[PDB]
Write a protein that binds this ligand. Sequence first.
Ligand SMILES: *Cc1c(COP(=O)(O)O)cnc(C)c1O
Ligand SMILES: *Cc1c(COP(=O)(O)O)cnc(C)c1O
Lengths: 401, 401
Amino acid sequence: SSWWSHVEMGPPDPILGVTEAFKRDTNSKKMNLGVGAYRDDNGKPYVLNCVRKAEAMIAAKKMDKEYLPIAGLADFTRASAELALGENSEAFKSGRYVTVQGISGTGSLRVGANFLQRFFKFSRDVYLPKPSWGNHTPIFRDAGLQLQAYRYYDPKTCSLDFTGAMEDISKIPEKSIILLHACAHNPTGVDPRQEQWKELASVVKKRNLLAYFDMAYQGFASGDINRDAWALRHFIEQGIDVVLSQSYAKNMGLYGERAGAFTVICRDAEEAKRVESQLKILIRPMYSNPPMNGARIASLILNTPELRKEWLVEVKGMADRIISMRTQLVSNLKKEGSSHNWQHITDQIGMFCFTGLKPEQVERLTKEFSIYMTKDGRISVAGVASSNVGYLAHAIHQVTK
Amino acid sequence: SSWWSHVEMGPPDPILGVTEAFKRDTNSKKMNLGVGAYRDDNGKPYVLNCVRKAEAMIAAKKMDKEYLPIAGLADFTRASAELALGENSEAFKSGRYVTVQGISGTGSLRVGANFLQRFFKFSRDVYLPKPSWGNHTPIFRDAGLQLQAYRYYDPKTCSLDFTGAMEDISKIPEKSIILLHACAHNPTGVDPRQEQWKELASVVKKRNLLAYFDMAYQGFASGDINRDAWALRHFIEQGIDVVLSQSYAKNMGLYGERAGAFTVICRDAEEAKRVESQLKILIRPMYSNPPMNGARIASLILNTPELRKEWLVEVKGMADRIISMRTQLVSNLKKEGSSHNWQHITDQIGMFCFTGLKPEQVERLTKEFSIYMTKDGRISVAGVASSNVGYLAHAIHQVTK
Ligand SMILES: *Cc1c(COP(=O)(O)O)cnc(C)c1O
Ligand SMILES: *Cc1c(COP(=O)(O)O)cnc(C)c1O
């Protein structure tokens, strides 16, 4: 009936552009630094051992495929909160939080956005760091909220614009919403240091802002689950009742299984139950109940001492590899006689690194070196291996010489 | 804080209540007729054999857990469209359809609803049959659409108000959206006969309405996948470009794995691509990408001749047990000396049956017999077994005599 003749072709994904060209390249020396998931030293996808084991365990138990409660798997949501807040957290012990399973971090972010749109009467403004993960915009926008921003990244030093951040935040109308990356800021890799987080907390507290933490790399950033959750935990201790989204896509390599959760810190256990009833109401008409596989896998790992223990080592190996690559990249640039300051590379944390390379330098690296990345100078450290770090150091040097 | 002080407790779920009250029951003869999923003759959850086999196949291959494209697993989307439309369908063969993996049937319905709120400029109204599955309301409402209704179920006859439907649909504003249950109407079990479907197709065509099919029971209703998709296929052949949602929850017993899909029938292959593009932009900010497990299983079964073969036998087996229970319930009621007309029980299709019972009687059944069901007189036939059917009939006789 020509119902859709007016539907226009959506704009193409740039990252997709990068991956495709990479795919077309025949030079065996090509590098894909546009990659969004972890890759091993051999440039291959990695399913943790503990994951294989957990999977085998489920298979062994001949479990049913019955619908999970709207809120998800209790063993999973509980373990998830404990993971984030800490076993001895006051918030945890008193049971004054409500955690619901979501469709990975994304779905959890969205549920949260929809929850705020509905019940957070104080404001519609959500302040994002400049820049932020691309998907954050439309998540909040689609949810019916308004987007604001605070200075974060400093192009000058490829570090944190602590001054701008603090000035921006100090002017945020009371009771507004501020989004913070728990650790391993995406896409810059620039995170505040402890002393800086202590200061941001003080202002967020003072200005009575609702803090929304996006925690997609717990344990994957520094290889330590406690350290990665430090800032989130610190806010809550200072009396800031945050909202939070967790993803296991990276830390457990559950990517496609979509395991994640949304958590609200409440005043007491009673209030938590009320909030939880409302989240159930929101979710039902969204997708009814959550996918079971990823949650079943995560819960087993988290709740099985042997698995959990093994997980920590594994997540640590992942973190270590990335760090080692940052280290080696810096070292090789020196060996190459790069007069430039590449400290930011080692100061940066996680999978993403804002290099400082200009659009033109990027082109050259692509055109001449078969090294693929986006024009923002952002590199996925996951695409770097022991075998090519040398080459990359080399190539970067040539275009910056 | 005190951000949530004003968030109040949500309304208690009924279906939820019967289940729990059911559990808290000691009568060894107790029955739960509120169950929303298939149960075998022993009252146990049933995981399909073909499903266990697909899983063993996946396990053996040691697959990665890498993100699926936004639109989901291609083998899955295609197989899915093929299942629905049929192998020789012109719509299928020409590629003038677009299918995206959704979070089962509900997430597919939601994506579909969000898509219409966005691009279906012709109207904001969605007409649901009277009555419709509970979830249908908030799905559309939350999507930003307006709900309307059309007469469907005839309480006087516990059958279809064909005349009422026809007059309602004939008076629906042109270019409005009309939701139709493909087969095994939930919650009444009342479906139009092939002949009535022809007539409905005609009015829908003439009024130029956008028909949105909800197909959650393909193969599960009659034991025949082709017969179950008859009405869908018929509309399409008549030149009605429908939109459709599929669930593999019931027909494959994939309940918690959440495998489903949303389909749009377009003018051409070209339009389908434009449409797909926009569906991707919509889904990204919802949940990023879909759960991989259920889609992997479903894809294996549909694409592997031997598994697909076994699947058809098992669905048939499920459908037959339900039909048998309907049959036995009626025979037992007669035998018991019941003078009431219970033909509706056998005329109805699927797992849900509108008994016609009255509240006070439902109450009686619960109180005196330990038979749990919702006060709407609806019973899940899945809860009936060969070993309790006699009990149920006896009880129903008693409260109705
Ligand atoms: C990974 C990521 C998410 C969520 O990803 P999922 O695959 O949906 O779990 C959210 N925020 C950031 C910053 C991320 O990097
Ligand atoms: C089962 C059902 C759905 C979707 O169920 P899911 O669990 O989300 O797949 C949609 N419509 C009707 C009428 C249903 O019975």
